[PDB]
Design a protein around this ligand. Sequence first.
Ligand code: XMM
Ligand code: XMM
Ligand code: XMM
Ligand code: XMM
Ligand code: CA
Ligand code: CA
Ligand code: CA
Ligand code: CA
Ligand code: MN
Ligand code: MN
Ligand code: MN
Ligand code: MN
Ligand code: MN
Ligand code: MN
Ligand code: MN
Ligand code: MN
Lengths: 238, 238, 238, 238
Amino acid sequence: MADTIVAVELDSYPNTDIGDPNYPHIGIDIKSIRSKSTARWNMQTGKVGTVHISYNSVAKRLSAVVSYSGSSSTTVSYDVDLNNVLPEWVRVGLSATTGLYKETNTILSWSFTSKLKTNSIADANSLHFSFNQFSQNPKDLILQGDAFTDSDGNLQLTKVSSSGDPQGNSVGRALFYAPVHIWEKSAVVASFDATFTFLIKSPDREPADGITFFIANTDTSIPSGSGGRLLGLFPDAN
Amino acid sequence: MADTIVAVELDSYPNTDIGDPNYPHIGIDIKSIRSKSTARWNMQTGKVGTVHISYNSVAKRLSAVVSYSGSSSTTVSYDVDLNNVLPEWVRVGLSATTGLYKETNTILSWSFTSKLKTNSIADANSLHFSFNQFSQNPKDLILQGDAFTDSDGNLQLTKVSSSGDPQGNSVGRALFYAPVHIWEKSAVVASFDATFTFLIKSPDREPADGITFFIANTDTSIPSGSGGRLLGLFPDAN
Amino acid sequence: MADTIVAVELDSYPNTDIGDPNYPHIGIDIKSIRSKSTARWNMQTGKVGTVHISYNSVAKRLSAVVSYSGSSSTTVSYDVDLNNVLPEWVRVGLSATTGLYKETNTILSWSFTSKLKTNSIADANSLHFSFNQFSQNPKDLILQGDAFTDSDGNLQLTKVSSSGDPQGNSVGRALFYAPVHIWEKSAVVASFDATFTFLIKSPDREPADGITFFIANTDTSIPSGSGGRLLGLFPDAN
Amino acid sequence: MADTIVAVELDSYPNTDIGDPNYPHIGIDIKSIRSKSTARWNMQTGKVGTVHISYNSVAKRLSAVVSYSGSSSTTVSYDVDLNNVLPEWVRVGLSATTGLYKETNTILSWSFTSKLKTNSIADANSLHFSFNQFSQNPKDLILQGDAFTDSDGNLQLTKVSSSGDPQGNSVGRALFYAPVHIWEKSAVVASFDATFTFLIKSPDREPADGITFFIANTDTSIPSGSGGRLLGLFPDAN
Ligand SMILES: OC[C@H]1O[C@H](Oc2c[nH]c3ccc(Br)c(Cl)c23)[C@@H](O)[C@@H](O)[C@@H]1O
Ligand SMILES: OC[C@H]1O[C@H](Oc2c[nH]c3ccc(Br)c(Cl)c23)[C@@H](O)[C@@H](O)[C@@H]1O
Ligand SMILES: OC[C@H]1O[C@H](Oc2c[nH]c3ccc(Br)c(Cl)c23)[C@@H](O)[C@@H](O)[C@@H]1O
Ligand SMILES: OC[C@H]1O[C@H](Oc2c[nH]c3ccc(Br)c(Cl)c23)[C@@H](O)[C@@H](O)[C@@H]1O
Ligand SMILES: [Ca+2]
Ligand SMILES: [Ca+2]
Ligand SMILES: [Ca+2]
Ligand SMILES: [Ca+2]
Ligand SMILES: [Mn+2]
Ligand SMILES: [Mn+2]
Ligand SMILES: [Mn+2]
Ligand SMILES: [Mn+2]
Ligand SMILES: [Mn+2]
Ligand SMILES: [Mn+2]
Ligand SMILES: [Mn+2]
Ligand SMILES: [Mn+2]
């Protein structure tokens, strides 16, 4: 049985044969690579970008924003009730790919908070983590595929040479080690927010393929055939 | 020279003559007592209730949920860009009233978090406070009208007798002492979250008038003529 | 090789044989059951207690306080550099035992925060979790020995019958699932704090054996021979 | 009539005639400019520094660490019960002065957390603010003397010219707007943590005079005659 995925994609490469708009874009992916909602993303290759993501079960609106120093931001939102989509326990992560074309998929920092409140006025259960650099052997991350942490304390989701040159046909992901509780039968409100900073560099005219923040079943793994345009998340483009 | 008001009301008394639905309701108030959105509130007089309020500038949805132990919740939301409504600096507060009819408007706890993030590398600016108990002399609150802290460590927004019985024609508010920064020219995303627990008791078969969490110009004060149905927030019913 | 243990013990049963003082006590344990520091704990069996523990690497003072509603608190401290003791990556946990004599070792809530500041700017890393009730399937806990979560949402560290009657000769522990990063080469300051609430009930005249909060090597497991007076932490009394 | 002051000073200029050690030093000040504890400061004029300060009422140890890019660290600690020094309600702030000699007293960020926990089931009361830039009109700061926010979003505690050259005989302070509750009779534990980053530059061979983080009576003001060596904090050198 396939994983169940919700993701925010920073999609650098337009794959118009599988429903991408014809420009780099941000998107909200609900169980499919074909985003439920997109916005045109004005990439700044070579510059550090920031992504902020948030949701809560009352508003039922998942939103993301991407910005760079000085520049205008790109936003995207989608109305969705995540408890109709995801299981009650999840893992959260980051993924990235390259394909025929390539780019660095470098993460410089990543934080995440979730809260789960029940009517029983026990206060909310909560989880927060923050990484402002990464350990070169990160015991609180599950690294999958080609993901690794370099000597600069950067998380490299996809392969780069010793010179820092990105490689094609690469896929990797990093999940936080602890499962996250995002609903239960008695729950009143669940919320989460996530931030990460990133550095996509590329020598290619058309960099590819992009980076995501994603939420999945706890035992999620890189699907077979999920390289390139599928962002290490899906086994097909349905 | 009137205040600028955004509020979530727990309106226990139907004033159908000024547009209330004909039942106790939770509502979102944008510069008018006449709610832009309401939902039926199934009151549990004598039982401790919990309200959670959330907003962010990307999703632009103001949401609130009210619940009691072992009971279903009631939610209300309204799509609104708060930057088009409120000033950049605000104060946040709780208000309550009684009129001809009455209830205790007792607050057992109140917390609030705000974050403001700009395009810069700088992490979000933030404020958080949490009161799970109120001090006899709460120097971090601006107490307005009949509002006072009692011997049990509770905030009473409106008058109660020496034996704990509510009095009619009362108005009271409590503002957090520090102004909150909610937008800036340079801003990328702003968000706030708030929670309070409340205890409404009444000897009246129909209690009145309600409690709000509100946001306003920093110099906000109880308007003249704001008693009873106007919840201590508005000078008229327009 | 043997685990590395730093613990705060709530030691309900005096084993004067192995150096316990002749009264219930709160103790700080560094690599030995024989506490580096103790203070008398005036137990209130059948009443909900609270423990707060804190440390930072500049002050180098590990402190704990135990209290009950309307009671005098008891404090214990020890001056130690915890990096002389602990590995850079640890798991944090709660343990309990019963032996010949018994008690319930019930956990009603548990929170923990750690922060590590280096050379990057704001926290190289932070981790916080808060459990105000425990799920029936707590996927973010590693439960060892007899530890289980019950129908009331409490964490029971040691065995209880269907009636809630504690059992003798029981051992149980619960670890937070994710490893915690408490030091690295570039580190300037590291800190943590933890809080738990507990309900110890017993039909025995002298309840036994107690509860700890502990920090260990990530791969920590209940040592052979760690029953009773050794609190599920140590293979012997050295 | 005189303020009540607790401070951590970064004293760039040795005033031996008022009991400074004869080198730049960090110190802990309890109701006097004459530090109760000092450490030689591994000082790096022209480089951005970071300060971390912490205290809790159980350990009763006020500790500070100053470092630069995670290196050149200086630490100072002092054993003191702040309950016996400070009032229950305070304001927290930053101060800085120049005198005959001069330096920029630039603050690039400032954060603060306080927690106060009593016997009750009630969880901690708390306050947190984080400023990673300073806005043009900081309505949540009480700016005293020469302190202002500049075009870069930095807080300048003392006078700098239009070109960025520091001026002599300056004094400035910034207080967080909300009073902070650091103790109550029913308290079990109270704690606070403060961080700030700073940038001290000087065309002088000897910069002066220094920067402090301080905790005072809520109504604290710059004492008359508190320039230069007295750091904007004390009326005299007693
Ligand atoms: O990295 C960009 C893309 O490269 C590959 O698709 C192609 C894009 N342009 C091409 C041109 C020729 C050939 Br053959 C291929 Cl496979 C492609 C595939 O790996 C895609 O999944 C990926 O999105
Ligand atoms: O507390 C409930 C209500 O009591 C008063 O309104 C009346 C309720 N019943 C009435 C009957 C007659 C007249 Br006149 C009035 Cl104003 C009222 C007014 O104080 C209202 O503002 C308030 O909402
Ligand atoms: O639970 C209380 C204690 O019970 C046992 O030790 C004894 C305490 N009193 C005794 C009396 C007789 C014998 Br045999 C034993 Cl083992 C004990 C052992 O299980 C101890 O580890 C434990 O601390
Ligand atoms: O900025 C450094 C110092 O400059 C002044 O003190 C003097 C330093 N050298 C002097 C020489 C003569 C005289 Br009079 C004075 Cl006050 C001083 C005073 O402003 C001091 O408070 C300050 O610490
Ligand atoms: Ca694509
Ligand atoms: Ca009404
Ligand atoms: Ca013992
Ligand atoms: Ca000096
Ligand atoms: Mn796409
Ligand atoms: Mn947000
Ligand atoms: Mn209404
Ligand atoms: Mn919330
Ligand atoms: Mn012991
Ligand atoms: Mn603490
Ligand atoms: Mn000095
Ligand atoms: Mn700290």
